[PDB]
Design an enzyme around this catalytic site. Sequence first.
Site, PDB file in Angstrom:
ATOM      1  N   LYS A  56       0.795  -1.227   0.000  1.00  0.00           N
ATOM      2  CA  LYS A  56       0.000   0.000   0.000  1.00  0.00           C
ATOM      3  C   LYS A  56       0.829   1.280   0.000  1.00  0.00           C
ATOM      4  O   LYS A  56       0.490   2.242  -0.690  1.00  0.00           O
ATOM      5  CB  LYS A  56      -0.934   0.005   1.212  1.00  0.00           C
ATOM      6  CG  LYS A  56      -1.842  -1.208   1.290  1.00  0.00           C
ATOM      7  CD  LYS A  56      -2.563  -1.278   2.624  1.00  0.00           C
ATOM      8  CE  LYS A  56      -3.430  -0.057   2.847  1.00  0.00           C
ATOM      9  NZ  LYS A  56      -4.197  -0.156   4.120  1.00  0.00           N
ATOM     10  N   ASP A  96       7.918   1.585  -2.049  1.00  0.00           N
ATOM     11  CA  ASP A  96       8.218   2.720  -1.185  1.00  0.00           C
ATOM     12  C   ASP A  96       9.505   2.490  -0.399  1.00  0.00           C
ATOM     13  O   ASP A  96      10.304   3.418  -0.223  1.00  0.00           O
ATOM     14  CB  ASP A  96       7.042   2.990  -0.246  1.00  0.00           C
ATOM     15  CG  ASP A  96       6.567   1.737   0.473  1.00  0.00           C
ATOM     16  OD1 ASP A  96       6.979   0.624   0.078  1.00  0.00           O
ATOM     17  OD2 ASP A  96       5.772   1.865   1.428  1.00  0.00           O
ATOM     18  N   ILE A  97       9.734   1.261   0.068  1.00  0.00           N
ATOM     19  CA  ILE A  97      10.950   0.927   0.797  1.00  0.00           C
ATOM     20  C   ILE A  97      11.437  -0.450   0.361  1.00  0.00           C
ATOM     21  O   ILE A  97      10.649  -1.314  -0.035  1.00  0.00           O
ATOM     22  CB  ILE A  97      10.741   0.979   2.330  1.00  0.00           C
ATOM     23  CG1 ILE A  97      12.089   1.043   3.054  1.00  0.00           C
ATOM     24  CG2 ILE A  97       9.923  -0.212   2.811  1.00  0.00           C
ATOM     25  CD1 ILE A  97      11.971   1.255   4.543  1.00  0.00           C
ATOM     26  N   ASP A  99      13.766  -3.371   1.980  1.00  0.00           N
ATOM     27  CA  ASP A  99      14.415  -3.804   3.205  1.00  0.00           C
ATOM     28  C   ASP A  99      14.986  -5.198   2.982  1.00  0.00           C
ATOM     29  O   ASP A  99      16.126  -5.327   2.501  1.00  0.00           O
ATOM     30  CB  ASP A  99      13.425  -3.728   4.375  1.00  0.00           C
ATOM     31  CG  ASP A  99      14.049  -4.119   5.699  1.00  0.00           C
ATOM     32  OD1 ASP A  99      15.262  -3.895   5.878  1.00  0.00           O
ATOM     33  OD2 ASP A  99      13.320  -4.648   6.564  1.00  0.00           O
ATOM     34  N   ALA A 101      14.269  -7.297   0.776  1.00  0.00           N
ATOM     35  CA  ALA A 101      14.167  -7.579  -0.653  1.00  0.00           C
ATOM     36  C   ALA A 101      13.467  -8.893  -0.967  1.00  0.00           C
ATOM     37  O   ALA A 101      13.410  -9.272  -2.140  1.00  0.00           O
ATOM     38  CB  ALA A 101      15.533  -7.564  -1.355  1.00  0.00           C
ATOM     39  N   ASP A 155       4.448   3.532   6.963  1.00  0.00           N
ATOM     40  CA  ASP A 155       3.451   3.614   8.020  1.00  0.00           C
ATOM     41  C   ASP A 155       3.952   2.957   9.297  1.00  0.00           C
ATOM     42  O   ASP A 155       4.981   2.274   9.324  1.00  0.00           O
ATOM     43  CB  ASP A 155       2.143   2.941   7.596  1.00  0.00           C
ATOM     44  CG  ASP A 155       2.264   1.434   7.537  1.00  0.00           C
ATOM     45  OD1 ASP A 155       2.857   0.924   6.564  1.00  0.00           O
ATOM     46  OD2 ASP A 155       1.772   0.759   8.467  1.00  0.00           O
TER      47      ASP A 155
END
Lengths: 181, 178
Positions: A56, A96-97, A99, A101, A155
Amino acid sequence: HHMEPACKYDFATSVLFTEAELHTRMRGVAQRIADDYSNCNLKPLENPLVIVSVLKGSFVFTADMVRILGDFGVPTRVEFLRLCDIRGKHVLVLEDILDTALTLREVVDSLKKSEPASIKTLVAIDKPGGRKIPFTAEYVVADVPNVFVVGYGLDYDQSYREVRDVVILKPSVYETWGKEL
Amino acid sequence: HHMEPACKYDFATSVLFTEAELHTRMRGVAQRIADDYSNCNLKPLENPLVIVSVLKGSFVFTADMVRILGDFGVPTRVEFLDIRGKHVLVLEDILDTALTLREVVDSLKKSEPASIKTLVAIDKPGGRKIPFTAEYVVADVPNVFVVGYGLDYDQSYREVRDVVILKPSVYETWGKEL
Ligand SMILES: Nc1nc2c(ncn2[C@@H]2O[C@H](COP(=O)(O)O)[C@@H](O)[C@H]2O)c(=O)[nH]1
Ligand SMILES: Nc1nc2c(ncn2[C@@H]2O[C@H](COP(=O)(O)O)[C@@H](O)[C@H]2O)c(=O)[nH]1
Ligand SMILES: [Mg+2]
Ligand SMILES: [Mg+2]
Ligand SMILES: [Mg+2]
Ligand SMILES: [Mg+2]
């Protein structure tokens, strides 16, 4: 005597990346993407770059990036995961990120089953120290140490995505919310 | 005599609302939402305003409005297409026939939210197949096909920063491309 001003947000201890320096980095990344896909002949409708956004938290990054990519002459079409015949087309996955993977690795290998023309990845925040398997994104907007952040889509229990910056929450935020029964 | 300047987009005949013009209205809507939910005690984590975004074209309008709501002290959490006892705000990029938005609202009232309202970026009043009114409207548009700000013509032109009207040659050229 060093003077350290208090954080701009009363819910965070530190602001790592503001909205302004995120967009400027994206305007730099967009130029590289426009240069790399210069030989692909990208046109609206006829042959757009298929942007695969991983829901999301990527919805903020996806919204800004496609508009910035459009400023550099990069036509796109958006798809959301968690779809569309990408066979023969160019695919650019957006997270978005990045980490561990593990999620991005599974998605890339999945889309390659449909045999697109090419497929790369663009992540807004790279967290290289939190990786479980070797993985390198072709395009990275910014890098962050191994610290949990929120904002710009990221988030904490589905909240604080609206924070325009990538910030580090105060520890009191977690315990005040933990104490809630 | 009258002179009309060329549109700033080579693919559009007209520019209806610019990015800045939409943002200004969105800040105006954000000030009203902050006033209407003033006595709801909205707070991150504990009791945020559940934003239900209607994929796909709403992702641009959802990303901008959610951040603007944060500037006006309105904490939100996003869902894309449980809310029992929570306040719900359905977001949709364009409201034309309202058939999709009415089904979503009626589907969400099954879970009995505290309250539920709707917010659309582009309202197309003269296109309704059923009567329906959104609580918050950023801008109105006549019965004309537009693109941009998430609105697409065959999955393209969502990335256009403004709400524009494509030239007929765009439809014709892509139509003759079979
Ligand atoms: N908001 C936020 N999410 C993160 C961060 N690092 C990893 N994540 C995301 O958090 C999830 C990891 O789940 P967890 O480790 O909390 O059980 C993944 O979706 C991952 O992409 C971070 O620094 N901030
Ligand atoms: N891009 C764009 N989409 C529209 C417009 N009006 C309605 N839509 C969307 O187009 C779809 C209906 O189009 P149709 O199925 O009639 O081709 C619905 O998803 C509706 O929300 C518009 O003016 N521009
Ligand atoms: Mg997650
Ligand atoms: Mg999360
Ligand atoms: Mg459409
Ligand atoms: Mg549609």
